[PDB]
Each structure stands twice: as C-alpha cells, then as structure tokens.
Amino acid sequence: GSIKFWDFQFATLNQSFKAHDADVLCLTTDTDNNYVFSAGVDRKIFQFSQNTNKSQKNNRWVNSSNRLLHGNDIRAICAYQSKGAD
Amino acid sequence: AVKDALRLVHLPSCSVFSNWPTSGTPLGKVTSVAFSPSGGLLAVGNEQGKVRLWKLNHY
Amino acid sequence: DSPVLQSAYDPSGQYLCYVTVALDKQRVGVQPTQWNENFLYLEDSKLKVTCLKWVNDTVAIILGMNNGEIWLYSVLANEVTYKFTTGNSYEIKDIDLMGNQLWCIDSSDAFYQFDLLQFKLLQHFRINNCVQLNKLTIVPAGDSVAQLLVASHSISLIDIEEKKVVMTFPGHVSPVSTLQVITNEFFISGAEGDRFLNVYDIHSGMTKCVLVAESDIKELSHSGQADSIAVTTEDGSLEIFVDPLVSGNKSKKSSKKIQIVSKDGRKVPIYNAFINKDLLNVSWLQNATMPYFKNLQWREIPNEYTVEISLNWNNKNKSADRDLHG
Amino acid sequence: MSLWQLETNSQQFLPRLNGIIIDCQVLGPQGNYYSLILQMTENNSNSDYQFLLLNASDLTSKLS
Amino acid sequence: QYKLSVVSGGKPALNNLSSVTGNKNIARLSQDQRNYIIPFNNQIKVYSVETRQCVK
Amino acid sequence: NYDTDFIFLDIESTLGVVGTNSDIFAEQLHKLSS
Amino acid sequence: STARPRIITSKAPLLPQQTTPEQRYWRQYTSAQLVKEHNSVTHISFNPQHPHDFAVTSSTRVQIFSSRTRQVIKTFSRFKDVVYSASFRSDGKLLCAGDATGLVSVYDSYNPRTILLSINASTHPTHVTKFHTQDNKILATASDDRVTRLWDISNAYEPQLELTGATDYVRTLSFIPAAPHLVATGSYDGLIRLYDTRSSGSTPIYSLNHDQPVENVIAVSPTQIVSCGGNNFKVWDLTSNKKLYERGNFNKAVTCLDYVENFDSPMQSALIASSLDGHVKVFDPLDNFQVKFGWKFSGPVLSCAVSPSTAQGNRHLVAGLSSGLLAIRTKKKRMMRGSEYQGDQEHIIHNDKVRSQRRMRAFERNINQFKWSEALDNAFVPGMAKELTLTVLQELRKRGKVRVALYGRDESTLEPLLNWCLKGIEDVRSASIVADWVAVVLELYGNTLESSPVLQELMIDLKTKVRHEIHKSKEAQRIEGMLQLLT
Amino acid sequence: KDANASHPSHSAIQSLSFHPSKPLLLTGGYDKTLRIYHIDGKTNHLVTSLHLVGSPIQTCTFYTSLSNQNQQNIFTAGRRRYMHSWDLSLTAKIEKFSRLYGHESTQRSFENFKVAHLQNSQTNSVHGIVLLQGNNGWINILHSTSGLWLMGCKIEGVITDFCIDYQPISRGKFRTILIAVNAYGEVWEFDLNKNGHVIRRWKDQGGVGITKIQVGGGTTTTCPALQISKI
C-alpha cells in the first residue's frame, strides 16, 4: 500500500504514504499532474492532490481525499480530460 | 579493531603526523575520540574502561 | 587532591575569591559565604595566576600573575580595572598591600613598591643574602611601611630605608608557604610538606612556640587578636589551636579537629577556613568546582567534630510527574 | 487526544484522559506543551472541568 | 462565637459560553515558561511546572 | 470534620468551616549577576 | 494518559466447601506415588538433623528412602524375625531397630555392613525403641514383657533404668520436650503413664486414663501431649493434669500420630493421624484441634509421617498401609562487560522500565481492538473454558452490544452460540446470560428461523432444556418452601 | 592525568563529548551509566553521574540551543527504541523520547543519532533536531525539544552514516545540509531548511565498503557555535 513519490533526477524518494491498506494495483493522473488517483485491492480509491500554489511551490503531495465505491476490488483505472469532459 | 589503532593527519598538507602515535603511547583498543572546542584537549577512550586525555601544545 | 588552585578570603569573612582551572584557562571567581558565578577567564595556559589578595573605597582583588604583571581586578564589575607592571617579564611570587602601599616580590629576587591610588612604580630594588623569595608581608604597626618580612627557606626581617637585613630567623627544610603576622610582635610561619608551625618574636629571633598538626598544612587563618589559629591540613581536616601563646610547654598539640564526612561515608576535603571572633567559615567542594560553606560556632563544639552533610549517592530519582510504582 | 501530521495524514494517539476533551492547543515558545481542557462527562449533573497541560516529550501529564 | 469561613476552591470556571468562542481556555503560561497562571471562580492560582504545587 | 468544627459545601462549589559596605556590595552583586 | 484495565475473570461465587488456605496448602500435595512392599508397613520415621531421609519398617527388612528422588537407597536385613520399630538418633547418625526376637540392634546410617551394637532385651519382642530427644546416648526400649527399659549405649551391657508399672503390652514412648527427665509411656489398658528419670522409676508420678487402650502417645509441647486409642484422639495437659480435647471423627481405631511445628505453612502447628480405615486426617492444634483435611488411600493405613520442619527441598507426606504398600504424596518448592553494572557508586539512579504484562488472551485483545464479532467468534472456540466464555459474554453484555455482535451472522455461525447455550442454560451462574443472549438472537433472527431448517432442532431442544430447568428450579423452590416451614 | 581517575568506569567508553562552552567532558558506555567530569590538567573530578537501569547507551552527547544558550540537554541513546533527554540547570529529571509518530516500522533502533540546529526559513525560530539512523534506507529527523516528527528522508542501499553541514545565506540566517552515505559510496546531500529533497548527489571516487563520514573544518557536532552568526 505504500504509494511512494520518487524524484526522477537524483533518483530518490521525494515523499511517501502508507495510505492504502493492501495491494495497490493501479493508479493514474491528469494532463498537468495536479492529481494522482490510486486504487488497490481493498477497493478504497483515493486521490492525492497538489492543487494549491504553495503546495506546487514546494511540489509536495497531500493525502487529500478518499472514496470507497466498490464491492470487491479494483484491478484497473484510467482518467481523461478535455474542455468539455473530465 | 586492533590495539594502538589511532592516527592524526595534518589536514591542509594532508601529511601524517609521525612522532606522536608511537608504540610508547597507551592508546589501547581505541573506541572513542573527541576534541575540545577551544582548549585543544584530545580525549581518547579505549575498551578497558578508561579515557586518557592528551593536550596539544599549539592551541 | 584539590582542583581549586588557590583561594583567598576577604577580611571579615564574606567573600571567597578562588581560582581553578577550566580547559587550560584560569576560571577565577568570587563566591559569597552566607549565587555569584559570572566571573572571568584569562586567555591561555601560559598566563596562570600566582598569588592573589583582597583589598577592602571599593572592594577588589589583586592577582599577581606569572608573565610579569599585577592585575587590579574589580568584583562588582567583572573586568580587570588596571594592570600594574614591572619592566621585567619575571614571575611575581607574592604580593601584599598595606593601605595604599603595595609590595610585590619577584622570582628574580627583586622587590617592587607600588601604590593603588597613584598607579605607578616607586622603587625597584634587590638586596644580598636573599637568593630565593616566595613570601613577603608588610608589618602591622599602623602605617609602618618599614621593617617588612620576606620569607623563603629562612625568614629575613628587612628594612625599607636602611634597606638591608636586620634579623634572620631559621626557617624550615622546605620553601615556606605560610607566613602571617598575628600580633604586633609575633608571626607564625610554616612550610609545606611538614606539620610544624613555628611562631617567632620579631625582636629577638627566639622561636617561642611550635604548633604541631596531624598533617602538613595548606592555609592558616588567625583571629583578630591571636588567640585562635585554624589551619587546613592536606588530608582535608581542620585543626584549630585555641589560645596558642600561653603555657604542652614548648610544642602545642592541636585542640579542635573538624572534619566533614557526608552521610554515605565519604570524606570530603576542607580548604581555606576562616576564623574571626567566635565563628568558623568552613569551605568545601561539593561538586567538582562549585564550593559550599558552613558557619560553624567555634568555641562550643567538642574537641573533635564530624560535620555531616547530605549528598546524592544512591537516591532513587522520584520524578515530579511519576509515582513510586511507575 | 489525536494529533495528525498532515504530510501523510497519520496520527499519534493518547487513549484515555479520564474525560472528554473541550479545548486543546499548543502553548509553548515553539510548541513543547499541549494544553487540554477536559470535562469528565460521566456525571450529567455538573460542568466539572479539569485543566491539564502536558509536555510533548513522552506525553506525560503535568499538574492536572 | 461561631463564624463561617470560606477556605477552599471551586471549579476552574473557563469562558463557559454557548459556542461564542472556539478558544474556551483562559489559562496562561508566563513568558519565563515555568509558571502556570490559572483563574478559578474563587481563586487565582499560580503553579510552578517543575514542582506542581500552588506556588502562590 | 472530627477536628471539632463543621464543613459545609456550596454549589458554586466552595468549602467553608463553621469556625471558632559588605551588605551594599552583596545587594549590588545579586543585582548585577542576574 | 493512564493504563489499560485488565479484563477480569469473575469466578464462582460463594458455593459451599469454600477454599480455605490450610486446605489449599495441603491440596497442592500432588503425585501420589504408590510403592509395593512385602508385608504390612508397621513403622515409619524420619531423619531429624537433615530432613531428607525416611525409614520404613517392613517384615524382616528395614528400608531407608531419600526425599530427593523417592526411591529405595538402603536396606537393613540382618533381622532374625519380623522387625518392628525403626527410629533415628537426633544427630541423624544412627538407626535403632527393635525386632521381634528381642535382640534390638542399632546400626549407623548408610552402613548396614556394620551393626554398631546389639542390645539384648528380654525374650519378648521389643516392640518399640527410640532415642532420647535431648540426650543422645540414652535409648528407650519397650517390649511386651509388660515393662520398658532405658539403656545407655556406651554402657550397653546393663539396663540403666528399669521402668515398670504398666499392666498389659507397653507399646509407645515419648519424652516431654522441655524437661528431659520426664518420660511418657503407653500401654494396652489405657493409663498413659509418665515417670521422672531421677526417681526410682517404678511407679508413675501421675497417670492419665484414656478409656480405650492407648495406641500412640506423642508430645507436641511441654504442656500438652496427645494420646490416641480407639476411634478418638485425646489431648491431655500436664500442668492441669487433665484431658482437655477429644476428637472422634473416624470409624476404626487411630493407629499413629505425629506433629509438626513452625514449618512453611499458613497453619503453624499440624498434628496428623492415621486411622486404620483408609483415611489420614490433619488436625489444627491452634483452634481447638479441628479437622482440616483428609487423604483417602486404598486400605487400612497403619502408619503415616510427614517431612520435618526444615526439609529444605521436596516436602513429603508418607503413609504405610497394612495391605503391603506405601503412599507418598509430595509437594515441591569481552564486549559486554558492563551490562550487569546495576548502579552501585553512581550518583543519581533513574528507573522507569515498565514490567512486561502477562500475555493477553485472544478474546481480550479482540475486545481491546474493538472487533466485537471476532471476539465472539474466537470466544466460542472449543479450546476455551467455561469462566472465560462467561466473562467474554458478560463483557459484551456490559460494554458493547449483543445486537452489534450478532448484526452480521447467518445460519452457520449462529449454531455454536446455541450449542454452547445448551450446556450453559442448565447450570447456575450462566443461565441469565444464556437467557438474554438466546432471547436477543431469536429477536433478531426470526425470519432466518423461518427460512433455514438447521437450528430449528436447536430451538426445539432448547425448549426442552428450558422445560427441564424450570422443572428443576420449581422443585428447588419447593425445597426452599419446606425449609421456610422447618424454620 | 587520566580523565577517568577520580571515578572508575566499567565498560567500553562508547561515547565522549564536550560541552561547547563549559568545561565538562561527558562520558558514556555499555555499563548503563553516564558520567560528566569536570576536566583540567593536574586533576579532573566527577560532577554528576546518572545511571539508567535497563538501558545501555551506544551514543550520548551534549546539546545547547543556539538561540537562548540556556537549555543544556543531554541526548543519550542505546540499542533500544527510546532515547533519553536530560535537562541541565542544577535530583534531576529526564524524559523518554520513544514515540515515532507516523513511522514506527522504520526505526529498529535508536543506535546512532546526531544533533543539529535548524532555522525554519520563514521565521527565525532556530530549534534543535535529532537525526536517527533508519533500517532500510531511511533517516528520520525529529524535534529536539518537543519530539514531533518533522520529515524523513531516504536513500537506497543501507544508510551507513551521515553528517551535518551548515552554510550561511545572509546575516543571521543559515541553511543546514544533511549529507548521508550509501554502503557503496554514492552519497546524497540534501538541505532540510525547506522540506528534505535532494539538491546534490555524488559518487565517491572509489571506496566500496564505507563505514563513516564526517564533515567539518567549520562548525559541526563536535564544535557548534553559540551566537547564530558565528556559524
């Protein structure tokens, strides 16, 4: 369940979360990466955010919102945006 | 690890101090070393349960 | 052994001025003898003090150092006020004042006069047949600047205007350590390493009495009229001679013996007591440097006295927020 | 008493304060003391509060 | 010759309002953080934190 | 209360009993050392 | 903060035969080892100065056992007839054995190859012999020559004292344990005698008459002695010269006694007795010689003895039966040099290490972790016990909700609740919790009772169990009524 | 003279340190005690000697706060999970730091720590910080006074040791830097006056099994400052 946000250059861990409770199986984002939506095998799909300007000045992620939606699992996820659909 | 296993190196010219850490010094199995902030005291604590205290004359 | 290098009581027993070592410097300090701690360090290890004395109009200390200076140092203000000097870099071995007249011996056998109201040198002179010097004392006969008493391994009563030796006493087999004038004619002396005090007439050279103690001495303190002299011995005891100028006929044994034993069975040493009329200011190092005191009533305690003090030895740290069973 | 570090949304818990909490905030010079105003609701008769503050070191109480 | 005499203290008596304040605590620490000044309905206690007595 | 008086209690809950140059140098040093 | 309250275990309330500490201390005597012998185990004595050995007296064969391992360690079999009395000297060094030929022999301990000396007693069987308690070198032998004698073992040739004055079958001796000049004997006409050894010793200075022929005379104090004959034991006091207690709680004649003082027990003094019936019973000389506990063996117990006051190891009760065997019921009592420093000379010592609690139960940590249905499920596992199940049921009643603990069940997991409740409804202390628990489960699961067929037979025989229990409680209420009549 | 002459010790002296202004040499070992000598040339004596039963102390060190210079804490940690904080103002009380807040599965032990200052970069609230060796690749920092978690940085491999650089920015304002080694030789240096993210990572030219790193020459743990601008 440890959703970990690694830095790309210098190749190490920017921050971490032990948010989930079991196997995380998939995740996604949007087109300019203010959100990361993770979803695992205990069906709790939750959304980490970077929306505020000071949080993107620090470029640090919060454990913003949670949602349970399902009966048994999640095994895949996807996201889409437009100017008429998201 | 071994007995009498401490050395001091002169840092700007990175030389090694020859005369002091000789076999007539009772360093013992050295397991801690610490400098004083201003007096130039040098404490070396060994495994047998004591700490000897040298003084550097230059400081 | 003491980490206090050397200490001196003020007259009328109120403040103890003591110098200890603290990481190759000299932590000097003044402590009241009923919390005074912000007192100075000098610079490096090659500037240690050698003698010190009070001056009681402000109140101050003089520190005869070893580099060649005397430092007149205030106590209320923390800084050194003035730096008396000779022209030589030689080690001042003892200093003694009398009113305004100050007098310091050297280690290179000289004598220097000074005055702490005009702040300048007066006379700069040596004499023959005094090959080492480590004590001197201006004599009390009012403003008797003349006829001072120098002392090293034998005691020489020397004039300041005839400027030569007028009497010579036999000293010890060691360099002298304590020489103090107790009357207008008697002075006590005693070297270190030996247990023998001898008092001398200043007008005959006859050793009137010999005081003995159970160890060699560190410092003596007499009363205001020479009827009680308390020495501190090197094994950390206090020996008080009562009425030492009466007549057990030539050599007086010690009368009062006060030693301080804590309530865990550990002997703590006593250095530099002070006895005015019917009190006793016993001083002792509780922790490694900070000293404590006791104002003991002097004439009423028995012949020996084990003063008890409390000290942490195995006390369970009961907290202010926990209980006994945790 | 639940204190939540916000960078992971994770808690440290103090389990039982013999009373419900009404007001609590930090009050140190840099945040080394936690005030607490607890109320002890198991009697519905009186409004009998209980003041305590406690240092953040090991969460031990001080002067209830 | 009897008399009544108040001897002992009561409840701490905070700002007991009906949600008119979210800061329902009027105790205080001194700026030397060693003394807790706390009002009562009957007293004004001053405690010392390292000893936990009513220091005045 | 068995010390031969009485103790009552309020509801504004209080309790009550039915009852029957060295000195100047030392002062300046204590001032200046702080 | 504070600590966590330990989940209590509400045990059985005040049922009769309540657990008293004397019967606790005697109850912890376990491991009754039974050892065969060849004939009736007549006499058993113990080792005084190192209480670690005891001597048993079979026919023609005296054995000594040790208390550390409880096996036979030495024998003594140079006996020309049946051997009767085995006793020890008070320095624990020499064993005196009176046999039936009359040549009463004393060996030393652990060396049966050397008979130390053979006292020639009378032609009659020397039935009891024992050493003096105070003095070492005087030895009392009573034969059935209606007489007893005191021998000095140094001057072993002649009777030092000739104590006559007893009529029929002198059988026991005991010495008054403060004044060593007072020797107490018993005979088979009653009339417990005692003599002053400084006197001529041919008549008792005062006699005490147990009406039954006395079987054992022991001393428990300088003041009072204990003599037994018939189916009762009687305590006499010498200062009042009078019988002052008698207990008769047996069937047949009591055959041996002894006493133990100041040993490790809540009961200070203890006098135990063997009774030829199958029972050995302990009596408490503090509170008027009441019975306290009794062990039952498989035949007429002919002698018994307990380990002495200072046994320092495994403490023993032993009893030789006349059937030919023996019962032993026992009770049993260079880099890390500084890491044991433990703070001797250092100034200030700080100590706040919390002791580790004993390991919490599965249901205890389940209720503490609030998983209530899992607490109930791990509670009704057949590896648990009755009081533990009753206390977790009481806990879920008092704190949580039984509705919550049953809000997610089905046909399957509701079975072991009722299956426990069948056994639980019948007894006393559980039936209220059984009652409201099955009441709330049938309140909450009525439609599943309509659908599912399995627990219907559980409800049926629960109805039968309730009818059986209401019949039993109704007749018990009738007994309560007739006791209210008889008061 | 021998610094352990007036009072004998009993285990290996596992850590020595000095008070950064006062003449006190602090000594601690595996005999679950910690003494503090007052030291000079001819002699040296004991001042206090606290003794913690149950717990050894693998490393123990002074700490003075930079702002007020009147805190004088002792931070003593052994092979267990807790470290102990002593306050010095002249019996005596201590506190038992034992609560990692969010991250309890990353501290097998408090076996190695350091102590370092930090100015908080939006206001000049200079406070101390203890820094712990992790178990996988972590290094947690904490708060010296309160005991909050602040952040935990992490490298790969094994954390073997680490050291604390300082660097000034303006008058009376400084940013610290934690330098931490791998067990292979590439080290990470990240500042932590902002949140702890890596500002440089570089490889030791050679070196395989590396075991200790120490920076200095300016100010560090063995010689901190007392004025803030003396950094």
Add this chain to the structure above:
RNA sequence: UGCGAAAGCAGUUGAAGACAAGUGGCUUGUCGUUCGUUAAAAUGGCCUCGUCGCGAAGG
C-alpha cells in the same frame, strides 16, 4: 413529566415564524427561530516503551 419501591401510579401531544424542495399560487421537509405545557445513517473506531594484559611527542 410528577410521585413512589427496585413495581406502578396520574397526565403531555400545541401556536407562530424562517428557510428549502417539489408541483404566480399550492403540497412536503429542516430549525445553532419565538411563546406556552411540570411533559442510526460521511468506511471513521483508543499509540509506543519484551529488546538485543603492559605502555607521558619510539622499543
């Protein structure tokens, strides 16, 4: 809600206002609204501290 015994005894239940929703009016619901009568429903549940020989800038 009142009495009283741990059981039971006698009796409440409205008026107005605001706001919302749904079908300009009209139906339904909530009250950090007033007077008067003694009158279930946000995946959210309680921490660690049981842990692992000697030898003062050579012999």
